[PDB]
Design a protein that fits this description.
4 copies of one chain form a homotetramer. By secondary structure, chain A is of the alpha+beta class. Helix content of chain A is about 15%, strand content about 30%. Chain A has one domain: Penicillin V Acylase, Chain A (4-Layer Sandwich). Chain A has an 8-stranded antiparallel β-sheet with strand order 13-12-11-8-7-6-3-20, with helices on one face. In chain A, strands 14-1-2-17-18-19 form a 6-stranded antiparallel β-sheet, with helices on one face. In chain A, strands 4-5 form a two-stranded antiparallel ribbon.
Amino acid sequence: MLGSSSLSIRTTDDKSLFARTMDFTMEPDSKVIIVPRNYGIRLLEKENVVINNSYAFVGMGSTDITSPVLYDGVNEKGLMGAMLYYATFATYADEPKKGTRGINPVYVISQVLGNCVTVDDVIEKLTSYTLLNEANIILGFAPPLHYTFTDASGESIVIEPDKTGITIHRKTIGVMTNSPGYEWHQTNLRAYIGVTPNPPQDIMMGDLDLTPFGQGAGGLGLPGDFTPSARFLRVAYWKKYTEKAKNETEGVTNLFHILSSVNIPKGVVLTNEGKTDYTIYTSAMCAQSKNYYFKLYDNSRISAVSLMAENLNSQDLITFEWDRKQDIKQLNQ
Amino acid sequence: MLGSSSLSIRTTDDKSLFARTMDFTMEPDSKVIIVPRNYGIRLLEKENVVINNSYAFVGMGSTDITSPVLYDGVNEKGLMGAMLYYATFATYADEPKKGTRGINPVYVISQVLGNCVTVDDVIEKLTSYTLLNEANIILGFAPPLHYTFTDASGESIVIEPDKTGITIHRKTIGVMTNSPGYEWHQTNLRAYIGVTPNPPQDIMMGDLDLTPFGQGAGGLGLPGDFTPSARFLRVAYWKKYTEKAKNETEGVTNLFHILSSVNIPKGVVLTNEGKTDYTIYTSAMCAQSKNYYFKLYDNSRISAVSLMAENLNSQDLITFEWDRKQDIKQLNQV
Amino acid sequence: MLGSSSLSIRTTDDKSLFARTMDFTMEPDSKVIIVPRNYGIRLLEKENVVINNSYAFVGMGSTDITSPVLYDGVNEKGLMGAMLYYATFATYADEPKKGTRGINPVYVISQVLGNCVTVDDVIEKLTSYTLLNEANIILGFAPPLHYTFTDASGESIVIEPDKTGITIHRKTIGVMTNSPGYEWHQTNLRAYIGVTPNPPQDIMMGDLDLTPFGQGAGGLGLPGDFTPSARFLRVAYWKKYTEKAKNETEGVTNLFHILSSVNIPKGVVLTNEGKTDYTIYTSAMCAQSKNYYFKLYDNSRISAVSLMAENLNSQDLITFEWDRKQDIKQLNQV
Amino acid sequence: MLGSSSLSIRTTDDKSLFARTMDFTMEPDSKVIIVPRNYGIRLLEKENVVINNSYAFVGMGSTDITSPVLYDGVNEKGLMGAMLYYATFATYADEPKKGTRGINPVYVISQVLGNCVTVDDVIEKLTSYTLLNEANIILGFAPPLHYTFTDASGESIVIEPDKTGITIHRKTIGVMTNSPGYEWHQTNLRAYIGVTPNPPQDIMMGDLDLTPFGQGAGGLGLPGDFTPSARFLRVAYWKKYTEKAKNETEGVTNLFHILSSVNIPKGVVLTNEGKTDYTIYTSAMCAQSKNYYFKLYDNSRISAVSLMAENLNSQDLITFEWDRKQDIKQLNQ
C-alpha cells in the first residue's frame, strides 16, 4: 500500500456495491482469497489467540503471514470493507487499553468481515480492540491504515486510528482515500461545489465573445494530480454526477470508470526513493450477490469470484491467482 | 463526436501505436470496418465521383452514408490517423479552390487511409482537396474537425482547417485533442513543465513541519476537468512520464492507462443542451502489425481485429459488431 | 464583516507586527478608536455589567453601541488582536456555563485588549466567560466570529468558538482568515509545499524544448480566488517567502504587500444577495511602538496613530475619522 | 525589466486611463521624465541620427543613455503607451528592411509618444522602421519586448515583434502582460469564463449539505501565481468585474486595485539565478488630463506629475526623483 481510492454506490436495483483501486511499488504475492466459516483468524502475529469467524468472506489479500490478510472484501451477510493507507495520521498503542484485546492493524478487515453484519456491529466490534504497534513480515513494520465499511443497506462508516484515539464517522458519503482524516476531506468538498457537468455561460469582454473550447468547463478547478486530497475530490464529484447504475453489472462498470480518473500509469508518480507508484489492481464487490470482481494493471478484462458458489464450510482456504496478461479477445485471427 | 483524446507512442521494439478515446452524446451505429482495396470512397455526398482506393484499412466507423466513414484506423501500409472535433475553429469553403476537388470533412480519414503511406503523402493528397461545408445525414451539418496522422516510422502531423486555410504541423509531440489549435496547446505545455512524477521537499513554516499527504504531489497544478485543453496536458504529460512500452501488447495497455486519465464517465459532462458527453469507445492500432484494438464504455475487455488476416481484395466491407455486455471471466460458478 | 485576512510577522530589530484586511458590503461608521484605561466596557449589550479595563488600546472599531467595539487593535502592553468571520463554524450558547459570565462575541477584542498582556493571559481570561448568542443593533444578530492574538514576544494564538466548545490553538503560524477552522487550513498547507519562489526546470518532449513563459512558475498550484481557504494559502505562503523586514516601517510595507494578494476590488466578489463584497480597509499594529497604521479602499496613503502619544487616563474615547479621499501628492501643479 | 502587467479602462467621465506594474530585480535609477517638444531622440544608440519629436510627453524612464528611454507614458495629444517584456518570443533584425530605418527596441515608446496621436498613427509610424538587434544598451542585448498603446479615444492595440515579422492586434481587450503572444492569451481567456463574482449554488452528496466557506467561490479555477499567463488572467477578469470608474481619481484607484492582484512582494519570485523579481513601481496616466500617477514598492502614497503644467517648449528634460520611503501621514504625535 502507498495509496488507494475507494467508493461505494447504490443501484436502482437495490444493490450496494463497493470499489477500490490499490496503488503500490511492486506487486507482492496477492490473490483473491475465500475464507470459509470457522477457519479462524489471528488477532496478533506474536500471540496465538485465534478468533473464530462466524462468517465466510471473499477478498483480495495475502497468505504470507499466519492468518489470511484481507485488503478488502465482502462477507456472506453483505458487509463490505477495505483497509487504506493513512500516512502520518495512523496512531497505534504499545498496550491494549484496559479491557480490550490487542489487534494487529493488518488484521482488522479479516476479523471484521469474519464476524460483523451491520456498520453498528463493526463499531461495537472495534471498540472491544486496541490497534497495536506490532510489525509484520510481508512489509516489515506496522503500516499506517484507516478503514472503510459499507453494509448491505448501503450505510458507510470510516474508522480512523488517530493520535487521540479511534475516530469514527457515521453515515459518510461513501468515499475514502488516504490522509488526511475523513473530516478534513469532507470539509474540503465545500471548496469545490462549483465543479459540475454544466458549462458556464458565454461572456463578453468589450467587443469580444468568449465561448468554451468544447465541453467539460463545468469542472474547472477540479485538480488532476494523484495526491489523496485530489483523489478524494475526483472520486466524490464523479460519484455525485455519474449516472445511477441500473443493475449490478452497470454498477461494476461505473465504479471502474469513476475510479479511472484516479488510476495511476507506471511512471507518473515516483516516491522519494525513486520508486514508481502505480495502480496494481482495481476491485469491486456486491453486497447482495456476494460477487467479487477485479481487473489488474496488465489486464483490463474483469474477473469474478462468487463466494456463495463455494463450500462455505470448507476445511481450507480457496484462492485464485492473478493473470497478469492482457486478455485480448481475437475477433479474427 | 463531441470530444476526443489521442496519442501515439513508439515501443522499444520499433513499433508505432496510435490510440484515441471517442467521446460522444449517444452512440449511433458504429462498428469496426475493413474497407478492401478498390472498394471506392465518395469525396462528397452531393456529388457522385467515387475515388478508387489503392489500400485496404481497418478502423472504427459508420456505414450509414454512401461510403464507409472512418473515425480512425490503420491501413495496410502502416498509416494511422483520426478525425477529432475542432469546435469553433474549423472553417470550410462553400466551393473548391481553383484546381482542387471538394471533399466532405467526414471522408478525409477514409480517403487518406485508402491512398496514402507516409506523413508527406497525406500533406500532398490534401493540397489536391478543399474541405467544403457539406452536411451529412447522420449529424445534419458539417462537423468542425481537425485531423491527426502517424505513419510507420512514428512521424506525427496535425492538420487543421483554420480560418486562414489548412494549417499543417509537422513532427508533433504525438498528442491531439480538440480546440483550440495545435500551436496553442503546444505553447500551453510550457506553463506546466513543473508537473513531474517527483514529490517536492518538506518545508517548515516556523516551528511547523510540512509534509505531503501521500504521493503524487509532484503533479500539483495539473487540472483534472475534461475540457480539451486539460485533456491535452494530461495525455501529453502522462505520455512523457509513462514507462516506455516494450512490445505491442504493453503498448496497447500503456495507451489505455494514459487515456484513462481522460476517460469520461456518463453524467460527469453535460452539453449546453444537457446531453451527456461520455467516452463511448477507446481504440488503438499498430502500424507494423496492422492490428486494431478497442474496448467499449460497457466492456473493458480489449478486442482485436487483424487487417492482414482478411482478404484485402474482397468485394464487400468486412465488419465486426460491438459487444456491449461487460465481458466478465467467471473464475467459479457466477 | 464578511471576511478578512490576517498575519503577524517579526522584524530583524525584534518587533512584532500584526495586519488585517477587512472585507465588507457597505462602508459603515468606523474609526480608529483610542480607549483609555478605566473607561469600562460592557460584557453583554442587554445587561448593565461593565468590566473596568486596566489597559489603554487603539484599533479600528465602532462606537455604535454602549461600549466601543474594536475589530482589531494593540494595547499599551503590546497585545495585538482581531476578530474575523467564522461562518458556518461559530457556535454560541443561550446561557453561561457554570461559573462563567456571558459575553457578546463583538465584545471579545475590547475586553481582552483592555485586560490582557500575553497570549497565556488571553487563554486564562477566556475560561471565565461563555460566548453568548446575543445580537446587536448594528447587524441585527450575533456575527459568526473567531479570534486571533499575538503578544509582544510574537507568539500567536487562534481561538475558535466551535460546536463542541472553545478551541484554542497555541503557537500558531500567525495567519488566520475565515472558515474553516485553523486546524483545517494548517493541514491544507501540506497540499501546497510545492508552491515556491523557484522556477521548475526545463524539460523536453521528443525534440521539443519547453521552458517557462517568464518568471513565477515555481508558484504553479496556488489558487487565485478570494475564498478564505485560498486567501489563507496566499497569506501563509507569501508570508514564508517574502523577505524579513529590517524595521517597523518595512514591516508595515511588507504586510500590506502580502495582504495585497488578498485585496478585493469592488465588483469581483458578489454575495448570494447580489451585494458587492470588497476590502474596505487594511491595518497594521506594532507591539513595541503601539502604533496603529491603516489605509482604505479609496485612500492608498497609510495613516498612523500613536497610542502612547495620548493621555491614557482620558475620560473620553479618542477617535480619528476615515479620510476617504485618495491622497495624491502633486509634484507640480495638478 | 523582468515582467509587468498592464490594462486600460474607460471612465463614465468619458476619460481613458492606462496602468502598469513594473517588475525587476533591484531599484534602477528611474525617474518620471517630461520630454519637451523638439528635444531629439535617437533611433539607434550606435548612430547619432536624431529624429525631432513634434510632441511633449511624460512617463517613467531612464536617462542612462543618449536619449531618454521611456517604459510607458502619455504625450500631449492623449496617446498612452508602454513596453513590456516578451521573453523567448521577441525577434529582431541584424539589418533594416529596404526602405526603413533601424530602431533600437528600447527607443520605441519614446519615438512613438513623441510623434503619434492615434493607434493608426502607431501602425503607420512602425512600418518605417525595422527593430534591430542592437547591443548595447549597455544593458546590453536589446531586451525582448512587446508593446501596447491606447489613444485618447480609448482604443488599444498590441505590437509584437514575432519570428514571422511584426504582428499587430487591433481592438484588443486592453490587457497585456508578458509572453506568450497576444492571441495566445486572448484564446486562454476562454478557458476561464466560469470565473465570475457569483457564488456557486449549494449541493448535496447523499444527506450531506455542502455550502461555501465564505464568499468568493465564483473564482475557483483562477490561478494565483505570478507567471505572465496567470497575471494576464487576473488582470482581464478583474478588469471585467471591477465597477466602472466614475471619474479620473476613481480610475487611478481602480487600476491600482486590479494591479494589486498582480503586485509581486520581494522574495516570493526568484529567477533561475536566484535574483529576486519584485514590483518596483505601479503607474497610471490619463489621456485627457495628461497626468502621470505613480507609487513604489516602498511608498504606497500616489504621486502625480502634470504634463500640461510644464513649459512644453523647454530646452531641457524635466525630472522627478522617486521618493523611496513610506509616506505615512501622522494623525497625532
